[PDB]
Amino acid sequence: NFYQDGPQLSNTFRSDEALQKILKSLLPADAQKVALPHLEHLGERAVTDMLTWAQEAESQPPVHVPFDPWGRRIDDIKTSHGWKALEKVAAEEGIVATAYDRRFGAASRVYQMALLYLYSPSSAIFSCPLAMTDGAARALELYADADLKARVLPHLLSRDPKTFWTAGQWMTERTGGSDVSGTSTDAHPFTGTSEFGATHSLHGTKWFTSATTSQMALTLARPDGAAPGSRGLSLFFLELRNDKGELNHIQIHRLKDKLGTKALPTAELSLQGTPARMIGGVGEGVKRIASVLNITRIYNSICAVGHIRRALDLAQDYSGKRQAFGKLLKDHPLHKSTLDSLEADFRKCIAFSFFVANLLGQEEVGEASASEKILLRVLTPILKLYTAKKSIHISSEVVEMFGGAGYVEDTGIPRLLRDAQVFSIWEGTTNVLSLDMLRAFEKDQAGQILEQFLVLNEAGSEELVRLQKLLTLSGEQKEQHAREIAFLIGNAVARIAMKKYSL
Template identity: 75%
Template structure:
């Protein structure tokens, strides 16, 4: 024991190691889709443990830097990223992480295929999955609302499998006045009268406090046209291109890169729009409605990335438990350690089932195969899914870091990053409280609560005592709230949302036999 050195955890093909993913896909995908998807996923699972993982390590070791001036004092605001980050972008294009959803070769199953790719790619992407989420969201918004000539200009790039022509997109809404509450947006939009390659209609002036994917080619943002009313109703959605023909920033000045708790490889900047040309998407005043299509996709991405993060953490813990000895035997042979892992694995499977269920609903909606009740479920469950998987990801990350003892607290093992990066899932695209209130809006505007009650009342899980007990408690809470006012519903919104997450994830775990 004098010269003992502990062997650390290692990664192998993440598709072949994932029984939950394989079981689910083989049960839900038609044979012809399996024939295409499964070999591709096996290939990507191997890359996730080899070259992608190596590039992610490089991207984390060499985070982006902001170079405001060239050697002669000219303002350039260059954001320089590592070769690893650039290679992860190329791989995302090659593997069709965004494009697969829009080929729609497999109908409603196209989204399941795509989200399975994302699920394997994300844990080895150094969070390049973030720009991909916004790219996908932008593609959907443009597909739905942009004029034909703008679609023809942007969509082939956003959906390209060729790294040389692939574009990513940013989503710039956060200002000093707030993040989720965009009503105080102070960016102004005045008429733009010069010629523009993409048909700019307005010039934007304002400060964006937090812009992820600031090295992207395009961005969608909210701004207030001249004369528009205050609050959310006065906001419009705009498309902008970051650089002009000479590759100069389009009247954009970058103040600084954000020094964040985690996601260190992801360039996130604070910047000013100083007359940036932009094109309005949709009618004036429709900004919040139009950005909702982006948020639906980015929130589902957040959930898929969260379960990918959980799976990576648990894979490392499982591997280590077969290598580390304590008190005379391997960790995996200690009943308490085994039980702790079992509970975490069950939480993961519940989140997995719910995430892919909602992804399938999204796929159905996009090809026109969704029923009225399923559309309401998609609306109500998207915020619940995001908040629920985020909380579970943080808990699993914390437990896994703890399982490594002191090694889990030492930066050069890479393990603390699980916890630091895991925290972003509950913050990006809406906090737990914000999303809980969004669920209440779905209850009010879409009458989603009766649809959920009908679903839970008739699901197979009603035969399981543990589910029936939770269902009874949920009904009791609803009974109390129905006698109260709006403040009572808001006060208990978080409890309600987490309860919906518990019930839905457990019912789907049983339905999918995971």
């Protein structure tokens, strides 16, 4: 008799007025001429072939096969065809490469982040490998010798699926992930054959990694003569496999069985003499990898806001199809008010995100003012923790908006919450990033540069007045209030950005 119609998606570029308004403000005419048709195309893929491949990957999670039938240690990771297909899309659509083709100045990074914004929610979180790939490319561009750059960058930035590499970023060990000072991976001097000029061999265990689907990784290790703690750490480049395709003295222990991001392989592994090449100098590892973090944290933000948009698209569509007590849900004043509130949060998030992406683009093309560089540094952790918390809140409300159906996995709706919860954890928790914000304040007059910016652009906001009072408090009291400070700034900046983009 009666059966409920479930939610349906529509082209994600055409359905997103906020994104279109933002790009009209941030993209110059020559950029729009190329970007808008590309984006409209990607928006179509997001609800057609990508959507199916993502569903396929989520329904067939990766499997570790440590041994072949005759006892050879192979450490294969079996993935779905859909997962492999989503990697190919990332290459051919230039989801990473677009940022590094800086034809459009600062707008190149904006255009790229718009591609990521459409791609990510339909990628089964392949966007995580892409974040680390982008971060790795920038790090190599900034710090690596010309020969290493010549070998690796054409792969990371390739638009050809056959040559495209992704990178892992292997920073977490059992001792800590927030704090890497306890890193126990040793780097012994290495003299031998290599295809990339390896200088050391690495011995240690990496506790969360993206396993072996990536061709390279960056990691931290402690050379034989180095000091303890963070300043005995150097940055290292390594390749996972040799010519023939066998792992370079890398052993996978197991895959993590995770709350969400289930299509994404996350492994514990051991480096057992893995050949590697030091980048930068002894002791410089932590501060050099800091430029990988800035990019991955802005990826995380954009992916979290794309996730919000996907949850709300499903909720909006359902609200026009589900009836209760005589009315469609969208026509119940309380239900509509809840949706409106979530959409308002979304608008803050997407404006804030692209405001920061623009700042990032400005810095990457050398056109950022001293003030803009400081703003980028302060706002990046704030953006990340802000959009992450919002994406979890919104995903949970959307699960509840579907009622009982929201709690049953074959509707696809519980995944929204399971996946969203990752965003406030990966690349730094709310508290770790709140403290990074407080430490950004202590350098280059950054607290005052932020204050001047807020006074210049919206002196009369309710957030600024409260924020000023908090910023006068003691050191440890500011730490205790660090979250409140972060969200006041995030909200103040979101409002400024929304006005700037006419949202």
